[PDB]
Amino acid sequence: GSLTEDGLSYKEKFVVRSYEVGSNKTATVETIANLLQEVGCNHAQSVGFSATTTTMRKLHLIWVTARMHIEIYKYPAWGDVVEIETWCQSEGRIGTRRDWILKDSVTGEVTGRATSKWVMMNQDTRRLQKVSDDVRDEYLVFCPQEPRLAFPEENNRSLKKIPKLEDPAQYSMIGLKPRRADLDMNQHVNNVTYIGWVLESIPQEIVDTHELQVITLDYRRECQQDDVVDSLTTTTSDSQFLHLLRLSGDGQEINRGTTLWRKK
Amino acid sequence: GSLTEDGLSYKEKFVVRSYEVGSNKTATVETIANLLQEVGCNHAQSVGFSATTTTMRKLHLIWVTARMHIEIYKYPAWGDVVEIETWCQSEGRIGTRRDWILKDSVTGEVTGRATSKWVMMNQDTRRLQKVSDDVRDEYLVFCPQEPRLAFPEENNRSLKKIPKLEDPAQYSMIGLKPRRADLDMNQHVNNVTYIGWVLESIPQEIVDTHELQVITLDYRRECQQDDVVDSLTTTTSNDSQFLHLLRLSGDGQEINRGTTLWRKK
Ligand SMILES: CCCC(=O)Nc1cccnc1Cl
Numbered sequence: 001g002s003l004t005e006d007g008l009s010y011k012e013k014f015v016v017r018s019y020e021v022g023s024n025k026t027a028t029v030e031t032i033a034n035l036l037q038e039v040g041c042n043h044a045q046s047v048g049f050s051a052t053t054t055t056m057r058k059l060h061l062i063w064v065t066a067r068m069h070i071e072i073y074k075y076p077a078w079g080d081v082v083e084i085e086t087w088c089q090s091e092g093r094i095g096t097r098r099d100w101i102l103k104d105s106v107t108g109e110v111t112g113r114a115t116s117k118w119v120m121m122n123q124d125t126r127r128l129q130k131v132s133d134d135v136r137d138e139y140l141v142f143c144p145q146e147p148r149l150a151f152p153e154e155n156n157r158s159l160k161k162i163p164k165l166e167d168p169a170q171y172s173m174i175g176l177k178p179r180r181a182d183l184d185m186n187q188h189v190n191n192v193t194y195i196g197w198v199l200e201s202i203p204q205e206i207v208d209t210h211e212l213q214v215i216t217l218d219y220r221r222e223c224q225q226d227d228v229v230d231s232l233t234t235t236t237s238d239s240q241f242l243h244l245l246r247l248s249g250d251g252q253e254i255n256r257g258t259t260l261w262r263k264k
Numbered sequence: 265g266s267l268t269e270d271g272l273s274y275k276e277k278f279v280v281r282s283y284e285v286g287s288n289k290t291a292t293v294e295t296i297a298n299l300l301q302e303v304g305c306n307h308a309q310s311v312g313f314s315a316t317t318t319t320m321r322k323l324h325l326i327w328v329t330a331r332m333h334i335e336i337y338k339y340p341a342w343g344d345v346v347e348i349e350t351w352c353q354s355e356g357r358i359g360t361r362r363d364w365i366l367k368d369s370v371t372g373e374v375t376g377r378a379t380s381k382w383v384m385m386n387q388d389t390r391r392l393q394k395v396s397d398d399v400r401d402e403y404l405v406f407c408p409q410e411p412r413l414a415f416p417e418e419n420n421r422s423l424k425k426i427p428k429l430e431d432p433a434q435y436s437m438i439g440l441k442p443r444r445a446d447l448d449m450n451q452h453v454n455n456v457t458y459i460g461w462v463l464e465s466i467p468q469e470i471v472d473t474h475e476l477q478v479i480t481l482d483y484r485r486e487c488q489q490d491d492v493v494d495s496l497t498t499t500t501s502n503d504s505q506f507l508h509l510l511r512l513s514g515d516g517q518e519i520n521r522g523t524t525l526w527r528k529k
Pocket residue numbers: 040043044047049051063064088089096097098118139142143
């Protein structure tokens with residue numbers, strides 16, 4: 001992994017591992033999401049963060065994901081090398097974008113792209129805050145100033161509003177609980193676990209006869225180590241689904257999302 | 265990674281990733297067990313298996329894990345490079361052993377060791393059989409002929425008999441279910457998921473104040489993708505030892521038993 005020539009993006013190569021692949025012997029979307037998260041962490045490290053800056057660490061501020069958007073054209077095979085490039089960009093005072101492009105190291109062909117929206121909130125109160133000008137100056141020097149979008153197109157899937165699934169759901173997987181392996185180093189549920197939980201309510205028949213092309217996920221509230229999630233899915237159509245994760249008991253929303261699947 | 269000079273072992277280097285680490289910012293024992301499985305697979309591929317030989321594929325036979333044994337002296341940190349060497353050895357008609365040594369790439373010091381016992385099974389019927397000569401000969405040419413043991417010691421903990429936990433358990437975690445991420449490419453539950461499930465019944469207190477030194481797991485039955493598992497733990501002991509049982513949440517059919525040993529941080 002390294003910063004590129006101009007110091008405004010970061011690249012890393014990954015060999016797909018035996019346990020990272022599903023039934024077609026290609027990388028799961030959960031493997032793809034872990035590697036986007038790993039290269040994001042390697043980019044923050046390379047520029048002095050650890051993703052808090054100077055003013056942020058003082059007043060107990062953190063970056064948190066509001067939304068993840070991933071489009072995969074081809075899933076890398078077991079043994080294949082994927083190259084991931086990542087960069088960040090200010091969205092004014094509303095927050096921050098991290099973008100990714102995935103390439104076949106062998107062909108140099110683009111095999112996927114992802115984008116994400118981050119907002120600042122207080123670690124303790126979990127209250128959102130429109131970013132301060134003193135915080136931007138610190139992190140703007142690691143970002144391209146001209147716009148660089150993994151998803152440039154005006155009216156594109158990555159920015160569409162997602163509605164709330166209405167009961168009854170067509171499909172459901174209930175009583176989902178995280179184990180220690182699902183937690184990060186600060187004992188919060190890792191963002192990638194929610195992607196698995198969303199996909200858990202897709203019927204095995206869809207997964208067997210289709211490949212996932214697009215996943216958009218809104219993050220509304222964290223699932224704690226001792227919470228229990230219900231995963232709900234209704235067909236909206238290629239196959240398209242509407243998704244909802246909510247706490248098993250009171251039915252408090254934690255995530256909503258959509259997926260688009262192509263017949264193999 | 266690559267086969268060594270003599271072609272009787274395999275070495276691979278792994279950089280520890282952000283999401284592979286726990287509260288201590290060092291690799292979890294599940295991350296370690298995944299890397300052991302990855303380097304085992306890279307060793308099989310290197311010598312032309314797929315971990316079946318020619319005869320095995322004809323007779324619908326497979327290697328399956330009967331027992332896993334991991335001892336960790338030091339968990340590598342986020343960003344550390346760890347080097348793993350692995351080899352196999354015949355235990356005659358009984359089955360085969362795969363051993364591992366983990367090293368700090370920087371110091372070259374031994375940070376861990378592991379050993380596993382594999383037996384030959386019919387894929388379909390699940391009925392064990394002793395290793396035949398025709399099969400023995402095919403894989404014998406990829407194995408050191410003189411003994412090479414990760415755990416040479418005389419009365420060593422990798423070989424101890426493991427008893428059945430008696431109800432009531434001191435601790436339990438109920439209604440454990442695998443999701444798709446827990447499954448391998450043939451849609452069987454990954455052996456490493458059982459390790460996580462065993463550890464789920466250890467109180468957070470022990471994990472916060474101790475480090476896992478040793479884990480021994482017997483594999484008795486597979487958890488199907490529509491099974492539900494109960495994890496049971498009783499303290500058997502500055503070192504804490506536990507006895508472990510995984511069973512199907514309904515009829516209480518045993519899937520696994522094990523022991524762990526923890527030392528205070
Ligand atoms: C939360 C998204 C921002 C982030 O991960 N921080 C970062 C790291 C490296 C360079 N530039 C930036 Cl903005």
